[PDB]
Structure formats: structure tokens, C-alpha cells
């Protein structure tokens, strides 16, 4: 036996960092009673098989950390010190602040006279770091209190993906999962540094390589990912659409598209209206006044019944495929080579290697994360990847898909629970002021007359009803609908988002902020503005693991505590391994994990902090009364707790949903109190509840499916690593989305050697088929109105086809593809004192703002200081030696870092000019460690765009000087 582990109890957990979702085994002293003694990998976990990157490996030093918050703290207005307080105090005095701010600021009707029932005086940030049950419960707490400004991490990295893939495939999620990477014949890694930022992903990427796959990295920088790829193709910042456009044209020129897949399963055959056109960088219906498009001009030619007309022959010159051929004609190798900075030889090599996966029995996958989509055309970048994957027949298949790598361990789940301004849980939109009744809300659901189109979003009413019945089970959904707040249909959707919250805060238009499991003082672009803007809050609530640059902004650099009147409540929460619950990984795997050690000191799980805090407000209204009390009073928080504390188990079961009476549905009998088997058995009449329709099937009468640790697989499942009995994924355990596209019309897979589903005598075999019905009877994209994979996507703001508009301003004056330079539906100074393109990115060893990893000696050991990576060219220009201290400055601020002179950074040729790029990690902050440096967001602009509301943290102008 091993003395260290000998007397410790062994529990399983899931890594609290990135969205790979690696398994841990935790060892806790005193047979579970005491502290953790060891944390390492779960050797039985199918994703990581016991392997951990340094972030996962060091989780012991995260949990058992002497710098962790021990009890609630209080900073009094204008004070320069923390006063330790009790929970009883913190949660009461917080509950008083909420109720006061609400009572005073709560308006029942907007200027237009439409019912809204909301406060715009309180904003919430966070978080993808909470359990799925905490994120849901938190979202509903804030919405009962009538908040609309509810945002988190997803807005920055995740928000561009959802519209792009939703438009293209019908859903916003990663199409496949991590294990599936091993089945790919070519892996294109672009806008991702996966070897550093999803490191266990590279277990499966290199098993793709072991079996003959080509690994391609397309990145402005040579990274640790680049070190292990067959092909490194250097691309200059923002030249991605040119790169992908040239690939689309290459695929069509050389006839490498999967013809049958394209004809049957994409919208290639659909006839676009005569109103659609494209000239010199502009589509038809362009309004120069409002810088918007009239998208009705892009509509399909509809048949007698209102169904889009199809020409299966693909001849009609207004066939999507023919308009597609016309549009990408301009993206020739010479033009694309020139703008990307990638040589014509190496472009051909990458196109040849990747477009070869157009073979029916070859699968190509694309991995991307955040790096490349931090501008107004991020959505069109992903759309270009969706369209390539549709042409080659890579969507639905094993080793295929669009692998949109999620960031945080539960950013998938936190988004699924609607912790963004525009979505309730289950991605049902937050109603606007003009959706005055529940019927009107349900009327906005589009329909299809096509008898081969499932059009599953038709069931929205069942989900919205079931959701209102989970919050307000004693009320009719139609009545319950009036309790929750609404946004102005007048205003811009981005007016309720991340960037505008800082802009509003800086204009003192917020009383209170919840910074719940986030570090906005380092995470927010243009930190100086944000740190100042926080001083214009009355009260601030930081729930976190450690004191940090947000909690303690008032005593930050060049801040005088005396002058700052912000009342701050710091609440210390328990670490992942100190609580039970579920997180959804990038693959939609909803994984259950268990407590190992008891919460450290007087720290609580987030669910207990928010439930107690709400319970205080609830009783505060029962005592005093005040503004519209029905939503707070009537909210069903009794189904959230057992034994006077937050119950992950019970919340999970509510989110799944159960029958509220004896119910006949789907030709099956169900008794009151029974768990809903799946979202197929939800109802609009109020018979059923379900906090999240996507969760319907996660926790059935059969038990907690998320908690299954069962590696049982049929041969066909084992051949591609579905692991359908390991945990559970939405929707209803469909591991690979659009899998109906992986077979012909007879139900035979395109690649039998790597089948996802297969029609074998009467049944689909392998994965859970994504859409019921016999082979050849239904269009494979069930969440799409028309049922097809969208090459042409007229729902997008920028146009139905991706088109290169320059996301760079300063170094560019000529679009070589049109007379339209910048995004015509989206001001930068470009001061010549700042001539270099600054960029921010991650190293393997640190996490986010480094609030967590700057507290871990071993991660600080490996990466102790903010650095600045520069080419040998810029080094000799600025007279900067490797390791020399440097000043990096912009219009927004400046900082010092250690120079790393490397050939891994190169100058870009932009309009026959050497433009030097300089690289910074945003993992640093003034709080810790000593000589660590501060956030790289001192330099970044807080200017976004009115569509995405995302700041440009990846290409911003800076100067770098020796010290």
C-alpha cells in the first residue's frame, strides 16, 4: 500500500479548468471527513485515461491553498481595509441592498407603456465555473429579482459560434466530441492552440496521426500545437475568410465536394429569389442610412405551398451551389496567398490534404476556439468552416464535424442555463416588450410545409410552458409568463451585453454589480476604464475562491481607497472537489462529480450562497412588502434544497422535469411525480415541468444518467469511441449531431469502417439517431426549418455567404476582393506612436486572468512573469535582447514584461509593408504573484460592434520599448 493514500477515501471529480472535462480521483483524509491528500487523473475516464495537463495535475495545490478566502469579508465605503464578518451579516446586508435597489429602480412598464417588470440598476457577471445546477438556479434567482443585464464568459468566446452553426446546422454546439478526433483523416486546427488550451484533446489528435491523419495548424504564431503538426501554415491576423474562401473555390474547381451529400443534405439545390445579388463587397437590400441589410431580399423562391423550390439537377443559375461557385470565384490562390501571407505552394498543400476528405470514406475535422473570431465578422469565419464541412460531407460523420472547442469546464452548461441577456435556459429567447402575452411569444416560432422536414423548434411552446411550470408550479404558464422581466424590442440586443454593462457602469447607470465567479478587473478589455467604472457602483458582490483584482479594485494601482465609495461584499466559495454537481464539457457530456474534502474553512458551495441570499430577500419582502413581489414570493425554491441546504441532486431532477399530474402523452401513461423520460414527453398544457428541456432525459426514473461511469460499448460504438453509457450528453445522448447525414437514403453509412448510425433490420444502430424516422424519409438537419445544411444562410447580419472584410483598421487601406474595406453593418485612432499589432493569448500552465493559477506555486514556478513575445526582426529594430525588461503601451494604458525573442513570431507583409506583431499573456494581475505583472487588458480597446458586442483583444495597436 501507499502511505499517502492508505487511509484516505477515494471519490471521482471532473477538472475545474478547460472544457475537455478530464476525470480526477480525489483522496480525502479521515475517510472523507478531513482535507484532500492527493488529486490525480481517473485512469478509467474514457476522455483522458488518467492523463492531466499541469492545471488539472495541480488541482490539489488549488484546493489545499493557505491563500484561499476563509470567510465573508466587508469593505465599507471609502475604507482601505477588509473587516471579517459572519455569513448571517453578509447575506442579510446584501439582501437589503438588492431589495432597496429593486424597490427604487423597478419599473413595471417602459416609456412605450409595455409591461417589462424589471430593474436596470443591478447587473450580474458569471459564470462558466459554477455547476450546471448552480448556473440554472442563479439565472432564475436573478430573473425573479427582475434582472435583464445577466452575462458571463460565453459572450466573448462562445457567442459567435451559436449563430454561425445554428444558421448552418440548426444548433450552436460542438458537432462531435473529443474521443471522435481519433477517427479523423485530416485535422485542421485554425483559431485554436489546442495542445496548450485543450491539452488532453492532443491524445486523440495524435491517435488520428498514428492512423494516417494529417494534422494542420493555421496560426499567426508557431506554438506548442505547431510543434506537433505535419503542416504549419502562417496566416496574418484577420486573413481567415480569404483562406477559407480560397479553400471553398479550390473544392469546387477540382470537384472534391461529396456530390450526393451536397445534393441531398445541403441547401445546394434550393432556388434563391431574383432579389438576391452581390456587387463590390455589398449584397442586395443594403441600407446605407442604418448600416443594415433588408434580409427579405435574400429569401428563397417559394413553391405553391410556401416551400423553397429545389432543382435536384443543380442547373438553375439561382441554385445555392451555382451562386456559391459565382461568389468564391474571386478567391484565387495568388490573391489568397498574397493577403494570408501563406505561400502558394503551402496553400495548395493544405487545400489538397484537407479537401481529400471530400471522399465518402475520408473524414476531415476543423478545431477552432476563440483566438480568430474577436471582431464583427467572427460569425462569417465559422460559417465558412460550416460550408466547407458541408461541401466535403464531413457533418454527421466520425472524425468530421465542426469542433468548436468550448473554453471553461461548464461554459457549455452555463450558456445552456441562459446566463446571457438574450436567452432563458434551453435557448428559449428572453421575451421582448412586444411579446406582451405567452401566445405572441409562441406565435414567433417559424413553420415548414415540407413533409420531410421535422422542424423540431415547433415544440418550443411545450419547453417554455414546462420551464415556467418548473419556476412557478402553482400558476398557469400564460399567467407565470408575466412574472419574468422583458427587454425593450426598441433597443439594440448588444445594449444588454458584456461591453455595454462596462460602458453603462462607467456612466454610473448601475447601483449594484454581482461579479459571481469572474475577475472583470482583469478579464474585461480596457482594464483602466473598468477598474474606474467599478468605483461608480454603490455595492459590489464578489463570490470567488481568493481575494482578487475585482474584490480589491479600490486599493489597486493609482487608486485612493479614501475617495472610492463602493461598498464591497467578498464571499468565499468552495472549490470544485469540495462539492457535488454536474458540468457540461465541449462535447455536451453532462458529467456528475462528488465532494472529496469538506468545504475549506467557512467557505460554501455557490448554490448555498445564492439560495440563502435569495431566502433573505424572499422573507424581507414577506416582512416589508415592496415592488412587484409575486416573482420572488411564488418562485419554487423548495425543490432546490434538502436538509436546509442546496441539493444538486434535486435541482438536476427539476431541470430534467417531472409530471405535475397523471398524464397521457406520446401514446404512453405517466403518473404524477414521475421524472420526464425525455423532451419528447413534455407538454404545453402545464401537465409537465422541466427547468431545461435539453436536460429532459439526464435524470429519469432510471436514475442520474450524468453519474454513469460505464464503458460498455457495442463493436460499432467502440470502433469510433461513442461511450454512450459513460455519463450523458444533450440532446437525449446523441453524441455526434446530424448523424442522419452519415448514411445514404437506404440507411447505409458513407464509411462503414467508421459508422455513426446504421439501419439494421428496423432499427438505427450505434449512436442515438439525431431524428426519428426510417432512412430516406426525413431531411437530416431536424432543427432547421427547411431541414438542410445551410451553404447559403440568409439569417446572418453580414450576408448569406462569408465575404472578406478587413477586421484590422490601421495597417490596411485596400480590400483585394471588393471596394468594401470594413464590415458595412458594423472608431479606431491608429496613432502612429503605436505601430505594432499587439495580441493576447494563453500558455498551458495558466488559467484565464490567472486569479486561480497565480495562487498555485507550481504553475507560477513554470510561468512566473508576464512576458512579451517578439520576432528577431523587431528585437534588432527596437534594440531588445532576449529577457530584457520592455514597456508595452497603447492609447488605453501601458505595462512592463520580460521580452521573449523567438522565430515563432514573424513580421506580416501588409500592402508591401513589414508590420510587426507582439504577443502578451493576459494571465497576470497586480494581486499576485510578486513581480508577476498586471493584466494585458490595460492595453486592449473596449470598442466592440453593435451586432456581436465583442472587444478586439487579438489585434490592437501597441508600441514596445526597451527599459
Amino acid at each position: 500500500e501507499l502511505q499517502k493514500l492508505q487511509w484516505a477515501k477515494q471519490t471521482t471529480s471532473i477538472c475545474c479548468y478547460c472544457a475537455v472535462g478530464c476525470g480526477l480521483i480525489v483522496h480525502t483524509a479521515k475517510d472523507g471527513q478531513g482535507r484532500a491528500v492527493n488529486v490525480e487523473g481517473d485512469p478509467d475516464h474514457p476522455i483522458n485515461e488518467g492523463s492531466l495537463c499541469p492545471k488539472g495535475a495541480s488541482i490539489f495545490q488549488l484546493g489545499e491553498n493557505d491563500q484561499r478566502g476563509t470567510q465573508p469579508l466587508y469593505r465599507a465605503p471609502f475604507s482601505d481595509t477588509w473587516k471579517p464578518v459572519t455569513w448571517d451579516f453578509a447575506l442579510t446586508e446584501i439582501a437589503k441592498r438588492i431589495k432597496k435597489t429593486r424597490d427604487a429602480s423597478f419599473t413595471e412598464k417602459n416609456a412605450a407603456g409595455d409591461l417589462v417588470n424589471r430593474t436596470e440598476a443591478i447587473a450580474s457577471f458569471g459564470s462558466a465555473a459554477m455547476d450546471n445546477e448552480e448556473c440554472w438556479a442563479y439565472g432564475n434567482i436573478l430573473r425573479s429579482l427582475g434582472l435583464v443585464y445577466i452575462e458571463h464568459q460565453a459572450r466573448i468566446x462562445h457567442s459567435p459560434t451559436v449563430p454561425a452553426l445554428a444558421e448552418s446546422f440548426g444548433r450552436g454546439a460542438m458537432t462531435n466530441h473529443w474521443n471522435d478526433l481519433a477517427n479523423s483523416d485530416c485535422i485542421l486546427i485554425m483559431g485554436s492552440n489546442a495542445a496548450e488550451n485543450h491539452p488532453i484533446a492532443f491524445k486523440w489528435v495524435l491517435r488520428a496521426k498514428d492512423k494516417g491523419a494529417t494534422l494542420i495548424h493555421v496560426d499567426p504564431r508557431f506554438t506548442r500545437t505547431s510543434a506537433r503538426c505535419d503542416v504549419y501554415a502562417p496566416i496574418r491576423s484577420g486573413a481567415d475568410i480569404p483562406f477559407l474562401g480560397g479553400l471553398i473555390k479550390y473544392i469546387l474547381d477540382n470537384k472534391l465536394y461529396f456530390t450526393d451529400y451536397v445534393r441531398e443534405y445541403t441547401n445546394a439545390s434550393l432556388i434563391v429569389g431574383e432579389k438576391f445579388s452581390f456587387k463590390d463587397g455589398l449584397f442586395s437590400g443594403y441600407d446605407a442610412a442604418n448600416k443594415k441589410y433588408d434580409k427579405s431580399m435574400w429569401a428563397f423562391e417559394l413553391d405553391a405551398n410556401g416551400v423553397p423550390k429545389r432543382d435536384p439537377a443543380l442547373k438553375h443559375p439561382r441554385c445555392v451551389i451555382n451562386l456559391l461557385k459565382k461568389h468564391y470565384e474571386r478567391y484565387n490562390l495568388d490573391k489568397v496567398a498574397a493577403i494570408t501571407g501563406t505561400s502558394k505552394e503551402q496553400l495548395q498543400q493544405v487545400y489538397k490534404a484537407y479537401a481529400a476528405t471530400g471522399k465518402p470514406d475520408k473524414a476531415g475535422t476543423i478545431m477552432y476556439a476563440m483566438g480568430w473570431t474577436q471582431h464583427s465578422v467572427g460569425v462569417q469565419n465559422i460559417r465558412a468552416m460550416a460550408m466547407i464541412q458541408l461541401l466535403l460531407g464531413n457533418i454527421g460523420v466520425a472524425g468530421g464535424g465542426v469542433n468548436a472547442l468550448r473554453g471553461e469546464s461548464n461554459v457549455q452548461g452555463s450558456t445552456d442555463q441562459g446566463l446571457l441577456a438574450h436567452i432563458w435556459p434551453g435557448y428559449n429567447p428572453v421575451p421582448n416588450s412586444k411579446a406582451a402575452t405567452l401566445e405572441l411569444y409562441n406565435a414567433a416560432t417559424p413553420q415548414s410545409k415540407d413533409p420531410m422536414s421535422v422542424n423540431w423548434w415547433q415544440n418550443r411552446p411545450k419547453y417554455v410552458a414546462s420551464y415556467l411550470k418548473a419556476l412557478y408550479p402553482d400558476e398557469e404558464p400564460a399567467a407565470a409568463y408575466d412574472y419574468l422581466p422583458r427587454i425593450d424590442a426598441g433597443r439594440k440586443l448588444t445594449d444588454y451585453f458584456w461591453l455595454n454593462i462596462f460602458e453603462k457602469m462607467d456612466k454610473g447607470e448601475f447601483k449594484g454589480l454581482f461579479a459571481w465567479g469572474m475577475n472583470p478587473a482583469c478579464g474585461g478589455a480596457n482594464a483602466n476604464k473598468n477598474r474606474k467604472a467599478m468605483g461608480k457602483l454603490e455595492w459590489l458582490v464578489n463570490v470567488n475562491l481568493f481575494e482578487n483584482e475585482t474584490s480589491s479594485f479600490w486599493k489597486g494601482p493609482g487608486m485612493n481607497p479614501a475617495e472610492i465609495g463602493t461598498e464591497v461584499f467578498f464571499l468565499p466559495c468552495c472549490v470544485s472537489i469540495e462539492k457535488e454537481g454536474s458540468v457540461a464539457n465541449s462535447g455536451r457530456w453532462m458529467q456528475w462529480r462528488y465532494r472529496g474534502p469538506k468545504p475549506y474553512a467557512e467557505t460554501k458551495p455557490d448554490g448555498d450562497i445564492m439560495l440563502d441570499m435569495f431566502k433573505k430577500v424572499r422573507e424581507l419582502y414577506a416582512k416589508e412588502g415592496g415592488a412587484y413581489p409575486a416573482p420572488i414570493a411564488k418562485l419554487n425554491i423548495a425543490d432546490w434544497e434538502e436538509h436546509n441546504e442546496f441539493s444538486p441532486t434535486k435541482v438536476a431532477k427539476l431541470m430534467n422535469g417531472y409530471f405535475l399530474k397523471d398524464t397521457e402523452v406520446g401514446g404512453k401513461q405517466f403518473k404524477k411525480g414521475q421524472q420526464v423520460p425525455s423532451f419528447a414527453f413534455l407538454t404545453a398544457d402545464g401537465s409537465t415541468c422541466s427547468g431545461n428541456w435539453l436536460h429532459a432525459g439526464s435524470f429519469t426514473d432510471a436514475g442520474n444518467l450524468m453519474a454513469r461511469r460505464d464503458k460498455t460499448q457495442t463493436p460499432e460504438q467502440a470502433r469510433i469511441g461513442l461511450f454512450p453509457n459513460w455519463s450523458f450528453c444533450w440532446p437525449v445522448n446523441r453524441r455526434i449531431l446530424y448523424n442522419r447525414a452519415s448514411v445514404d437514403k437506404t440507411g447505409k453509412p458513407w464509411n462503414p469502417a467508421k459508422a455513426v448510425i446504421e439501419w439494421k433490420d428496423g432499427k438505427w444502430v450505434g449512436d442515438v439517431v439525431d431524428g426519428g424516422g426510417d432512412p430516406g424519409t426525413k431531411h437530416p438537419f431536424i432543427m432547421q426549418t427547411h431541414g438542410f445544411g445551410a451553404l447559403y444562410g440568409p439569417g446572418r447580419e453580414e450576408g448569406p455567404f462569408p465575404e472578406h472584410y478587413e477586421p484590422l483598421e490601421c495597417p490596411v487601406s485596400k480590400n483585394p476582393f471588393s471596394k468594401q474595406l470594413h464590415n458595412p453593418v458594423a472608431k479606431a485612432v491608429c496613432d502612429p506612436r503605436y505601430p505594432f499589432i499587439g495580441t493576447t493569448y494563453r500558455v498551458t500552465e495558466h488559467w484565464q486572468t490567472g486569479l486561480m493559477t497565480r495562487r498555485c506555486a507550481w504553475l507560477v514556478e513554470a510561468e512566473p512573469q508576464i512576458f512579451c513575445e517578439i520576432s528577431k526582426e523587431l528585437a534588432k529594430l527596437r534594440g531588445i535582447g532576449n529577457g530584457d525588461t520592455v514597456k508595452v503601451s497603447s492609447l488605453r494604458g501601458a505595462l512592463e514584461a520580460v521580452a521573449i525573442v523567438t522565430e515563432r513570431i514573424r513580421p506580416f507583409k501588409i500592402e508591401g509593408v513589414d508590420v510587426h506583431m507582439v504577443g502578451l499573456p493576459w494571465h497576470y494581475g497586480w494581486m499576485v504573484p510578486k513581480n508577476g505583472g498586471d493584466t494585458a487588458n490595460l492595453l486592449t480597446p473596449s470598442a466592440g460592434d453593435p451586432n456581436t458586442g465583442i472587444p478586439e483583444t487579438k489585434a490592437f495597436m501597441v508600441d514596445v520599448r526597451k527599459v
Partner: protein, 214 residues
Amino acid sequence: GKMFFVDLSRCTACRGCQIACKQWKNLPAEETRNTGSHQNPPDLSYVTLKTVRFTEKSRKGPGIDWLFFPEQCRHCVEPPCKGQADVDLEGAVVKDETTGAVLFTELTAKVDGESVRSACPYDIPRIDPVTKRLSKCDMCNDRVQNGLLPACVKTCPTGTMNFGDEQEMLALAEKRLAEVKKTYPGAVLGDPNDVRVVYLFTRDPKDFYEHAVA
């Protein structure tokens, strides 16, 4: 006995191995600075049994050959460290017969530390300024005897780190050397007949580190 196969053609330099080694033995962190490299700690020490060394090499075309070397004791079949230390006290350094682990005992506080380092052709041994104890990779001999993989081998996500019976690991090294050669035609196994940590180098081992081979 037991053997490591380190296929350096799969290393992402994630440094999972470096952190996992310290987490298992609960070793303290060094005081480090950035001096224009990601590499840290710079060298092995009393408290660091393994550091990942980063080397950038020029190549015509875009990018570089980025060389990653997770350094540990080689656990040599005929340890120069033992032979040296046995002139002072036969016991300070012992070879475990079942695993093949070369282990430094507490009696290394008696022997000459600087002299046992010099005897080492890989420059592995490190002295405690206080104790005068020699410390290095102990092979996770603890875990191996109890049927667990070494901490650095378990944590490794790329398949760079392999561990097992020396017959099986020799077989894997020869097989993998053949396959890797197809892309890196100058790939060589580090001192296959002398050491129990067989590194597969993609090129001249001296590029990875000056003491990468005896």
C-alpha cells in the same frame, strides 16, 4: 526490470509531467524569473527532480523545430553514481533489483555530493545546501512496486511517456523508431543498452540538451 520509453516526437511540452512529479512527492516550488524563455525551472535542483527544457532550432520554411526534453535520471543498468558513492559508503546509493530503480538513500549526506554529480554522465544529481542529501527522479519506485505507473507517465496526455517491462518497452522503442523515422529520418534511441529511460530523439540529441546522451 522496468523501463521508460519517452517518444519526444509526441511532446507538446504541456509540463503535466513536471507538475505531476511535484504533486505526488509534495515537493516545494522554486523561486523563478522569466529570462526570455518558457523553460522554468531553468535547471534540475534538490526540489526539482524533472524540468522540461525548451530549445528553438531554425529550419528553412515557416516555423521552427521546437525541441522539448523532460529531463529525469536515466536509471542506468551500471550506475556511475553508485560506483562513485560506494568508495565512501556502500548503501548511500542502491539499485532496486526488481524495478531496476537507482535510489539515493539518506546516507548520501555522508558521501561527497559534488563528486557523485561529476561521476554522472547526464549531470542529474543535485545536493541540498543544508542536508547535503543527493536528490533526483526516484522512478516513482513507491508506485511501481504497488502496480501504479510513475506520476509523470500517468499524467502525460500525448503518449510521449511510456512505462512497463524492459522487454515490452524495448519492443515499443524499436517499433516506434521505425515509424517516427518516416517523418524524422534522423531519429535515434538514447543509449538503449545502458539506460532504463530510453528517449526517442527526432534528431541529434545534443540539440535537445548537451547531456541528453552519455
